[PDB]
């Protein structure tokens, strides 16, 4: 039961120094790219966005896979929703500025910005032989010494009120309080470019709303009680359940690598499902450390439901379905449904030693 799960968590602790070292490699490469981008007139305002809950500038999204976000302070943004998608928007500037070279009419071109961003980085990773860095295809994906991959996301920062599509999102009122929800909604939001001809290209220059910076505000301040996990009397298992969900997905993706059925699923999906379960189970007494196995089952059952019903709401944008057929094909969701069901009904053989 829970003892198999606690053993998994104890084993995860053994790779803490591998992780810390890789995160240091990433940090060096990114600092170097940061000062070069700052030379460019378009990217003079670039900086690192703190999104990690463990390491500040670097978020780990899988073993030796790391995520980094470069933000661009961008004033006076005017948004126009693209074809009722709730998450994708055209970016204009309320009535010159450094980004003027990327305009196509009033509209800021995602693909032109991405193109110069990529070009500057690809040119720059050529030029330090202290580490070996190439570029794969997240604006850019790097590979460091053929082992550690870094996804680098460029994002516009907007200090305006959040778009109306988020009005019913971040549904934390009954768990973390309406006061906290108000404070978090005073923070900036971010727009990440979607190339006009990439993916199944819209043929438009649209940007997706991004709230990845909110994760650390909540994951490390996660209780109904303000002192949850700050003393020995208030120990919950929220963080451990999330770790186990991520590890479940990681291990399944590894086992199904022969035909890569699970390529489209990521830790973002797991995290989104996990925080929906936090909304559903707002009391700290529902996450008692002694109940690790039941709490994990709660999390897996909800993820399974999302898979079977092909529905996983964006935590911030309820009308945006992360599991829509536009984003993940039906056979992928049907396939993972079957595997998650098997693991849950058989006490997670994927965690066996
Ligand atoms: C309580 C809470 C707080 C934050 C998050 C959160 C948000 C985002 C986001 O909206 O950017 C995340 C993320 C985690 N992990 C990865 N991304 C990035 C997604 C993304 C964005 C744009 C294009 C493609 C993909 C969650 Cl689920 C819950
Ligand atoms: Zn806690």
Swiss-Prot record:
Q: Where is this site: Arginine-anchor?
A: 95
- Give the sites modified to PolyADP-ribosyl aspartic acid: 31
Phenotype upon changing residue 208 to I: Alters enzyme activity, leading to the appearance of 3'-5' linked cGAMP. Abolishes enzyme activity
Site (Cleavage) at 151-152
Q: Which cofactor does it need?
A: Mg(2+); Mn(2+); Zn(2+)
Q: Where does Zn(2+) bind?
A: 222, 228-229, 236
Task: Using the UniProt annotation, give all residue ranges assigned to the region (DNA-binding).
Answer: 13-55, 216-239
Effect of substituting residue 266 to C:
Gains susceptibility to mouse-specific RU.521
Modification (Microbial infection) Deamidated asparagine, positions: 50, 221
Q: What is this protein called?
A: Cyclic GMP-AMP synthase
Q: Which organism is this entry from?
A: Homo sapiens (Human)
